[PDB]
Amino acid sequence: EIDPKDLTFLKELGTGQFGVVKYGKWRGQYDVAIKMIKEGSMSEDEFIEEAKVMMNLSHEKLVQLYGVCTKQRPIFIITEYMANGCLLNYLREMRHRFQTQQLLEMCKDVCEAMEYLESKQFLHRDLAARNCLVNDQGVVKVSDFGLSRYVLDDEYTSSVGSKFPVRWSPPEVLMYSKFSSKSDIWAFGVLMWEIYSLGKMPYERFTNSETAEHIAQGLRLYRPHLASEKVYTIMYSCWHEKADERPTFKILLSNILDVMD
Amino acid sequence: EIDPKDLTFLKELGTGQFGVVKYGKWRGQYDVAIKMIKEGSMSEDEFIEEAKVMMNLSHEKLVQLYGVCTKQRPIFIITEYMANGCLLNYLREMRHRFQTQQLLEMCKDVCEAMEYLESKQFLHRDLAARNCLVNDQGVVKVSDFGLSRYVLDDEYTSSVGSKFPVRWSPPEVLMYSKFSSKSDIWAFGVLMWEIYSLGKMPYERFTNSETAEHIAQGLRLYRPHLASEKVYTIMYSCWHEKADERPTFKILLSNILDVMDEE
Amino acid sequence: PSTAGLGYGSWEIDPKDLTFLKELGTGQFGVVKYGKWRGQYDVAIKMIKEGSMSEDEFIEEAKVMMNLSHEKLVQLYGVCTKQRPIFIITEYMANGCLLNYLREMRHRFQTQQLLEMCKDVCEAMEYLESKQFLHRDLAARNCLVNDQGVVKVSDFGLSRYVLDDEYTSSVGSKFPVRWSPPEVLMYSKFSSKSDIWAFGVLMWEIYSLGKMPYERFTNSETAEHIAQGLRLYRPHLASEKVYTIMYSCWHEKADERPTFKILLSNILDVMDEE
Amino acid sequence: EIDPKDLTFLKELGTGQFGVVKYGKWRGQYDVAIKMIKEGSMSEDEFIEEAKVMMNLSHEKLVQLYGVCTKQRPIFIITEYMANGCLLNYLREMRHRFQTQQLLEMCKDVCEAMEYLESKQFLHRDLAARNCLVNDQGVVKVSDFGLSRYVLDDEYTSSVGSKFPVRWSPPEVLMYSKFSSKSDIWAFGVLMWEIYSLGKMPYERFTNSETAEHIAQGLRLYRPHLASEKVYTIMYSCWHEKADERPTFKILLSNILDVMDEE
Ligand SMILES: */C=C/C(=O)Nc1cc(Nc2cc(-c3cccc(NC(=O)c4ccc(C(C)(C)C)cc4)c3C)cn(C)c2=O)ccc1C(=O)N1CCOCC1
Ligand SMILES: */C=C\C(=O)Nc1cc(Nc2cc(-c3cccc(NC(=O)c4ccc(C(C)(C)C)cc4)c3C)cn(C)c2=O)ccc1C(=O)N1CCOCC1
Ligand SMILES: */C=C\C(=O)Nc1cc(Nc2cc(-c3cccc(NC(=O)c4ccc(C(C)(C)C)cc4)c3C)cn(C)c2=O)ccc1C(=O)N1CCOCC1
Ligand SMILES: */C=C\C(=O)Nc1cc(Nc2cc(-c3cccc(NC(=O)c4ccc(C(C)(C)C)cc4)c3C)cn(C)c2=O)ccc1C(=O)N1CCOCC1
């Protein structure tokens, strides 16, 4: 719960699924991003009671949420800042000409966060590159975890809506709307592909409708040019037909660790 | 050698590095493709002189040489016709909608062919999907083997020419132009990638001179969409930096089969 | 970028009203699919792949294209630009590519049928010529057939927007060398008259029932030799009267080539002569 | 058309209805302000095809449009640069404390501009001190005249919108969306009130809904303290309920000129 005395508004980050997001300083001290929830976008009545659970999710590879402004419509959601912005925007730029070692740490940065969330029995529900944000330390973090539950937008919420993350959804979500820890695993593997493909669109020559059938039909994404054969086996592992035969994040962390050292 | 009196020139099959290619009937029964070897394209003495070592080569998966015509200028080279045409054009097509089991088998037909050459100590020196043709039965065959030896274009034979097969070549060729079966091995792996990717150009967004630097800095290609985790493993194995650590075609054919038992 | 603020109107289609049904193959801009719009209309939908198109240029300028309406053009319904990839939505031609249709030895024409195909295209081209719009890649591969067997011209003026160096440059692998006049090959001088040159070649493609022009030569050899005045011979199933029309398209001097209007008049005269 | 290669982007000047505006220089010389038009904020096709009429509007007291950059996105609109910024701020300074003569001279500058637009059958349609700028010479000039027509925002275009200029609109605009020379006249009187009140908001203790209701009941702005009776008579003449009894900018300029000789 953040009083707005601390809150200065400096520059705007973008307008997101919940409307406008801003960056400033909270406490004239700790740099923040500032979600200014647009009215009617969010199930705030749902969000408020949860919010304790969400505030008690602490990890260094998570974009922590410092607090809320509940004594206003809009509500303000305050998060830590990532000054290097979108993972996707970052991945695409070849100016780094990113090293393979780099991309792998980037997967590790995420797996770390997801392992924590997994042990918290907490689901992202929408794990993608776009929902990852990079900081001044070149460190990538997971954002907007479990906030999908409160989206009021029929295109987003619905499995055939314009906004539903079909390309990150496992066989079961697409069919039975069955979200589990393992549906989180399916998305992480696709993120891994996004990272290795340096910002390429998954299934880019398929539409959302077509993607959703051929996922059932059994086909899968490529091994991106920069992935080793092992590095691929790890991502592909996320993609087992039966969800109970996919690894946990914990498992994926060990496989990833093996590869580095 | 063939009597040119037994060749009838029918349709066109386009043009090649030594010029035009035709299709015809040899003796009026064997349907054949004739190369006509244009002026200055080929090292002509130092062709027919080895030719018997290219001629005597026979395998189910190589496109068969039938002969030549050398008493005449330009010389003819007479080869087995392939209906289903270019691997690279065959591959791309929607009408096939290629099954992954279909790609690996096509990888098997190519590897079988390469292994036989390996046995007979015969380099190809330009292996790629552009250099494979498809018969009526969707059988893949490798052609034009050894012909890179006699080519009289510098752009083709010079590492940096605007023809040189840069995207299909190993570090030891790109930097010191050293050819063995292992640079023929490097070529197969890229070919697998071509097949699994349905006709994508390798290293598409890098130019030939750029790629020639980049592969020489350690990196490679993306295992294609339809490429399995184990399937990539084979194709990758071909791209070892030290040529010794790359596999033989004989091992590859086994590895492919062992995926074949399962997949 | 998108179409907002540009006054496209109904040309900016809401993709929610699109159904995707089958793949149709790939072109220079990537995948194309077949589908329905509003549950009522057969369409083809291009999905513009990344890096393939000068999207900013296309969007600013595409209102001219959308306003092209002729029964012999494969007309554009509209675009979806509030998203990526962009969708280009056009009418569906059920009988597909012209060359396969011609090459179909399963179908055997009267020659009068081939001339009618030439007329259809000429009519499409005369219209474009009237609107001062260059097609820039007229070729049989870029012609489609409806279920009445009518031939229509596709993908006019979209060449402007390709980013592939090899397609754009006259020295490139994908450039339409066999359909280009000397002034295009030597000087990159595009005009209504390069479209005329191409049309003559297209007529040759039709009357040869789908042969590739100059195919004994490479792209670079063809370029060199045309500049040396090489011209295509008369297809066997082509009369001298017909051959004369296509041949007229190939005068070395652009100014001496006919207009599409002149060509249409010539084609009608042959039809009506005999 | 302006070649943007000729333009430098040297300072940001905040954000308007169409988005960001920046300070810059044109061809090394001219000081310029550049509107970078936000996508979907403007009906750009409509503006462009009438834009010539605007460009040619030439008067000393108008913020001159110099040109446009449209072979692009975002589109640019390039104008004269005004150093002392928006009038409303300038007025709200006792850092500058005006004589009343300065205030009247401000009214005359605007009235001169309006008389010219009025002569061109061109409506401003959003005249207010917010849309008036002051150059380094202390001249007030009218800005963004006619650009209201091209706004894509129902909040601004709708009479009951949150952004609509309710406080500057005559009853026939509020009731009937009837814009004319006479609507610009009413707005001008409100603008004179803004000037003499040193930037107070008109009808301050009423909301837009209240203001509309009440002006139809005949509520009128009171005489600002620095405004003489003769000046108040002039602004008030702007506010007749019946549009055809409001003066012209020609008549208003004459009255202002008369006060200046005498007062
Ligand atoms: C107002 C604070 C101030 O002093 N600003 C300032 C301005 C200038 N010069 C200047 C500014 C602008 C400008 C900048 C932003 C936004 C707009 N408005 C629009 O673009 C716009 C208005 C209305 C409409 C409607 C269609 C009517 C709704 C549409 C768009 C404008 C106009 C434009 N020009 C040409 C300028 O010259 C300079 C300096 C300042 C300033 O900040 N200071 C001046 C000196 O003391 C320091 C502060
Ligand atoms: C790809 C754009 C980008 O890189 N932006 C960017 C961000 C940034 N820092 C941060 C931005 C945000 C932020 C801003 C706008 C919108 C959102 N998203 C949501 O609000 C949101 C998303 C998804 C959901 C669901 C629940 C999953 C559906 C809900 C809400 C966000 C997150 C947030 N934080 C914490 C940021 O730190 C900095 C800089 C940029 C940027 O544009 N660039 C930086 C790199 O170079 C310049 C470009
Ligand atoms: C993809 C179009 C296609 O299908 N072509 C096609 C091929 C075909 N069968 C044969 C083609 C050739 C042939 C034709 C031209 C050029 C070459 N290459 C060379 O001559 C050559 C290549 C490389 C080198 C080096 C050594 C690398 C330098 C030298 C020379 C070739 C090989 C040859 N043979 C023997 C063929 O059988 C038949 C038919 C087609 C074809 O046009 N179609 C296929 C069926 O549908 C209709 C269209
Ligand atoms: C020859 C195969 C065939 O018949 N295909 C076919 C097509 C069809 N109808 C349509 C196809 C397309 C279409 C599909 C893919 C790619 C393209 N090309 C481009 O998008 C393109 C072309 C040129 C350019 C430049 C810029 C000029 C270089 C860019 C892009 C096209 C055009 C489009 N429309 C509108 C179609 O209607 C229907 C059916 C078939 C087909 O498979 N058959 C025909 C009927 O018998 C069965 C087989």
The reply to whether C24 and C133 lie within a common domain is no
C47 near C85, Cβ under 8 Å?
yes
Strand partners, A69: A76
CB contact set of A156 (below 8 Å; sequence gap of 6+): A17, A148, A163, A164
CB contact set of D261 (below 8 Å; sequence gap of 6+): none
Pocket test for ligand 1, best of D9, D11, D15, D21 (most atoms within 8 A of CB): D21
The reply to whether C60 and C120 lie within a common domain is no
HEC sequence for B75-126:
CEEEEECCCCEEHHHHHHCCCCCCCHHHHHHHHHHHHHHHHHHHHCCCCCCC
Q: Which two tokens stand for residue D41?
A: 């904020």
Question: Would you say the CB of residue C95 lies under 6 angstroms from ligand 4?
Answer: yes
Q: Closest Cα to residue B133, out of B253, B41, B215, B13?
A: B13
d(C-alpha D122, C-alpha D170), whole Å: 18
Task: Identify the H or E element spanning B214.
Answer: helix B208-214
Q: Sign of the CA dihedral D161, D162, D167, D168?
A: negative
Q: Closest Cα to residue A127, out of A139, A137, A115?
A: A115
Measured in Å, residue D85 CA sits from the centre of ligand 1 at 6
* Ligand 4 atom index nearest CA of C167: 28
Helix A249-260 and helix A100-119, axial crossing angle in degrees, nearest 10: 150
d(C-alpha D158, C-alpha D155), whole Å: 6
d(C-alpha B25, C-alpha B19), whole Å: 20
* Ligand 1 atom index nearest CA of D18: 30
A170 near A179, Cβ under 8 Å?
no
Q: Which two tokens stand for residue B217?
A: 């800095």
Q: Closest Cα to residue C85, out of D161, A200, B72, A238?
A: A200
Strand partners, B164: none
- The answer to whether the Cβ–Cβ distance between A225 and B220 falls below 8 Å is yes
Task: Identify the H or E element spanning B133.
Answer: strand B132-134
Alpha-carbon distance D38 to nearest alpha carbon in chain C (angstroms): 9
Strands C30-37, C18-27: parallel, antiparallel or unpaired by DSSP? antiparallel
Contact of chains D and B by CB distance (3 or more pairs under 8 angstroms): no
d(C-alpha B260, C-alpha B142), whole Å: 21
D56 near D46, Cβ under 8 Å?
no
Q: How far is CA D244 from CA C82, D171, D181, in A?
A: 47, 13, 10
C154 near C143, Cβ under 8 Å?
yes
Phi, psi values for residue A133, rounded to 5°: -135, 130
Does the annotation count C137 as an active-site position? yes
* Ligand 3 atom index nearest CA of B126: 27
d(C-alpha B186, C-alpha C236), whole Å: 48
The reply to whether C57 and C113 lie within a common domain is no
The reply to whether B134 and B189 lie within a common domain is yes
Per the structure, the complete domain to which residue C3 belongs is given by 1-92
The reply to whether D146 and D182 lie within a common domain is yes
- The answer to whether the Cβ–Cβ distance between C20 and A207 falls below 8 Å is yes
The reply to whether B141 and B121 lie within a common domain is yes
**CATH number of the domain encompassing residue D215:** 1.10.510.10
Q: Closest Cα to residue A91, out of A107, A82, A103, A81?
A: A103
Strand partners, A19: A16
Alpha-carbon distance B130 to nearest alpha carbon in chain C (angstroms): 14
- The answer to whether the Cβ–Cβ distance between A207 and C50 falls below 8 Å is no
User: In whole angstroms, how large is the CA radius of gyration of chain D?
Assistant: 18
d(C-alpha B206, C-alpha A225), whole Å: 13
* Ligand 2 atom index nearest CA of A90: 45
On the CB side of C120, how many CA atoms lie within 13 Å of its CA? 25
Strand partners, B36: B76
CB contact set of C32 (below 8 Å; sequence gap of 6+): C23, C24, C25, C26, C44, C45, C46, C47
Q: Which two tokens stand for residue A60?
A: 């260094």
Strand ranges across the sheet with D65-69: D11-16, D19-26, D30-36, D76-80, D65-69
Side chain identity at residue D174, one-letter code: L
d(C-alpha C33, C-alpha C22), whole Å: 6
d(C-alpha B62, C-alpha B82), whole Å: 11
A150 near A47, Cβ under 8 Å?
yes
CB contact set of C66 (below 8 Å; sequence gap of 6+): C8, C11, C76, C78, C79
B79 near B63, Cβ under 8 Å?
yes
What is the DSSP code string of C150-167? -EEE-STT-GGGB--HHH
The reply to whether D190 and D244 lie within a common domain is yes
Q: Sign of the CA dihedral D199, D205, D207, D211?
A: negative
List gaps in chain A by the residue before each (C–N > 2.5 Å): none
Helix B249-262 and helix B100-119, axial crossing angle in degrees, nearest 10: 150
The reply to whether C151 and C170 lie within a common domain is yes
Q: Which two tokens stand for residue C139?
A: 């070729």
Q: How many CB atoms lie under 10 A from the CB of residue D177?
A: 12
Number of domains in chain B: 2
- Among residues C14, C42, C56, C137, the one annotated as catalytic is C137
d(C-alpha D44, C-alpha D37), whole Å: 9
CA angle, residues D238, D239, D245, in degrees to nearest 5: 70
Strand partners, D76: D36, D69
Q: Which of A162, A205, A209 sits opposite C31 (nearest CB)?
A: A205
Cβ neighbours of C6 in D, within 8 Å: 44-45
Cβ neighbours of B236 in A, within 8 Å: 228-229
d(C-alpha D104, C-alpha B225), whole Å: 76
Task: Identify the H or E element spanning D30.
Answer: strand D30-36
Q: How far is CA B1 from CA A110, B6, B78, C89, D115, in A?
A: 66, 11, 8, 57, 99
Q: Which two tokens stand for residue B235?
A: 């194709």
CB contact set of A128 (below 8 Å; sequence gap of 6+): A165, A168, A187, A190, A191, A194
Q: Which two tokens stand for residue D182?
A: 């006479």
**CATH number of the domain encompassing residue A3:** 3.30.200.20
Task: Identify the H or E element spanning C61.
Answer: helix C55-61
D35: annotated binding-site residue?
A: yes
Q: Cis peptide before C15, with omega less than 30 degrees from 0?
A: no
A141 near A90, Cβ under 8 Å?
no
Cβ neighbours of B221 in A, within 8 Å: 225
Q: Which-ligand-closest: CA of A140?
A: 2
Pocket test for ligand 4, best of C41, C74, C97, C164 (most atoms within 8 A of CB): C97
d(C-alpha C159, C-alpha C137), whole Å: 7
Measured in Å, residue D124 CA sits from the centre of ligand 1 at 17
Measured in Å, residue A74 CA sits from the centre of ligand 2 at 19
> Which residue, A35, A60, A81, sits at the end of a domain?
A81
> Which residue, A81, A104, A130, sits at the end of a domain?
A81
d(C-alpha B51, C-alpha A144), whole Å: 69
Q: How far is CA D54 from CA D65, D77, D131, D153, in A?
A: 8, 12, 16, 21
Tell me the three state secondary structure of residue C110: coil
Q: Closest Cα to residue A116, out of A57, A156, A73, A41?
A: A57
Phi, psi values for residue C248, rounded to 5°: -65, -20
The b/e string for C230-246 (b: 16+ C-beta within 10 A; e otherwise) is: eebebbeebeeebbebb
Q: Sign of the CA dihedral C82, A202, C41, B92?
A: positive
Alpha-carbon distance B211 to nearest alpha carbon in chain A (angstroms): 13
d(C-alpha C256, C-alpha A143), whole Å: 67
Q: Which two tokens stand for residue C207?
A: 């009357």
Q: Closest Cα to residue C272, out of C119, C149, C72?
A: C119
What is the DSSP code string of chain A? ---TTSB---EEEEEETTEEEEEEEETTTEEEEEEEPPTTTB-HHHHHHHHHHHHT---TTB--EEEEETTSSS-EEEEE--TT-BHHHHHH-TTS---HHHHHHHHHHHHHHHHHHHHTT---SS--GGGEEE-TTS-EEE-STT-GGGB--HHHHSTTSTTS-GGG--HHHHHH----HHHHHHHHHHHHHHHHTTSPPTTTTS-HHHHHHHHHHT------TT--HHHHHHHHHTT-SSGGGSPPHHHHHHHHHHHH-
Known binding-site positions of A for clofedanol: 79-82, 147
- List residues in chain C touching A: CB distance below 8 A: 15-16, 19-20, 26, 30-31, 33, 47, 49-50, 85
DSSP-derived letter for residue B149 is G
d(C-alpha A34, C-alpha A68), whole Å: 9
- List residues in chain C touching D: CB distance below 8 A: 1-2, 4-7, 56, 59-60, 63
Active-site residue set of B: 126
B140 near B89, Cβ under 8 Å?
no
Q: Determine the residue of chain A that is closest to C25 in CA distance.
A: A205
The reply to whether C119 and C254 lie within a common domain is yes
The reply to whether A167 and A66 lie within a common domain is no
Tell me the three state secondary structure of residue B25: strand
DSSP-derived letter for residue B51 is H
The reply to whether B127 and B177 lie within a common domain is yes
Tell me the three state secondary structure of residue C68: coil
A70 near A78, Cβ under 8 Å?
no
Tell me the three state secondary structure of residue D26: strand
Task: Identify the H or E element spanning B14.
Answer: strand B7-16
d(C-alpha C229, C-alpha A106), whole Å: 60
Q: Sign of the CA dihedral C83, C84, C87, C88?
A: positive
- The answer to whether the Cβ–Cβ distance between D46 and C7 falls below 8 Å is yes
d(C-alpha C77, C-alpha C66), whole Å: 7
> Which residue, B58, B81, B104, sits at the end of a domain?
B81
Measured in Å, residue C156 CA sits from the centre of ligand 4 at 13
The reply to whether A222 and A97 lie within a common domain is yes
Chains that touch D (3 or more CB pairs under 8 A): C
Q: Closest Cα to residue D128, out of D160, D164, D101?
A: D164
Q: Determine the residue of chain D that is closest to C58 in CA distance.
A: D72
Structural biology method used: X-ray
